[PDB]
Design a protein around this ligand. Structure first.
Ligand SMILES: [Ca+2]
Ligand SMILES: [Ca+2]
Ligand SMILES: [Ca+2]
Ligand SMILES: [Ca+2]
Ligand SMILES: [Ca+2]
Lengths: 164, 164
């Protein structure tokens, strides 16, 4: 809409560049997390996220992954590609949206909003790849975790947040 | 080893101003929490850490709680009162240390070091009362949590560090 009140007032692009009204997720627990551009998903975060999905997929937990190139201070070897460098694919169970920036000038309105969560307690810049956010059924930012917190460690909060 | 390599390379004052070398904690997993400076163990965090402690003190978990008045020092109807500006008494099984600054020009050297953790991923200033850090048996910072993350939600990582 126009009054950033909830995460549901936001619409984002999916991998297909098609609009997705986040408002369709109400009633479900949103676990928002920024993923890397790397092409391979080697990181352990994905595996653990899959499990989390495997377990709470049909219970209200929806994982919203967002590719971001603002980190991964890669050690180049043939990366110089400005016409097709971002991974042209993301093989995972949960949904992977269009690549967006989480920090800086062109930051996504959503992350801007996720950052106002809990009176600015969540106001920090996304520290690195895989920062985790938990949103309740009403679209309010409930929790935030550092990249270094494996998805599996968010189970207790996921569980509670679902009333299971 | 002039320049600190670990949390063990720091000496802090305890509630009774007696120097404490963090080396006496080597071989133990540490939960470092900054607490409100005012009196009152009513905040939910206390009960949860209390529980955490009762269930892990005798397994390798130590809790270093540091009082700080940098957050909402304007809370008590009568806070203005300068006779110290930190509660003269903090009933708790787990040790409460002397007051320290966590942010700014007088931030405790220990908090400067913890903010160095994970290649700067933990560089953010302490957001509010009750931010959490998990340090391994070796004295290196391995996790950081937002104030909003309840203690009990750190159990998985604790067990993982204590190896259980
Ligand atoms: Ca960019
Ligand atoms: Ca971890
Ligand atoms: Ca020492
Ligand atoms: Ca003030
Ligand atoms: Ca851990």
């Amino acid at each position: 809409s126009k009054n950033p009140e909830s995460v549901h007032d936001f619409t984002v692009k999916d991998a297909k560049e098609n609009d997705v009204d986040l408002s369709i997720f109400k009633g479900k627990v949103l676990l928002i997390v920024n993923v890397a551009s790397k092409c391979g998903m080697t990181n352990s975060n994905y595996a653990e996220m899959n499990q989390l999905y495997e377990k709470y997929k049909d219970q209200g937990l929806e994982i919203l992954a967002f590719p971001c190139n603002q980190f991964g201070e890669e050690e180049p070897g043939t990366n110089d590609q400005i016409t097709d460098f971002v991974c042209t694919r993301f093989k995972s169970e949960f949904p992977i949206f269009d690549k967006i920036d989480v920090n800086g000038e062109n930051a996504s309105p959503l992350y801007r909003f996720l950052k106002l969560g809990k009176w600015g307690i969540f106001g920090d810049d996304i520290q690195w790849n895989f920062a985790k956010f938990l949103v309740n059924k009403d679209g309010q930012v409930v929790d935030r975790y550092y990249p270094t917190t494996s998805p599996l460690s968010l189970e207790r909060d996921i569980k509670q947040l679902l009333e299971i």
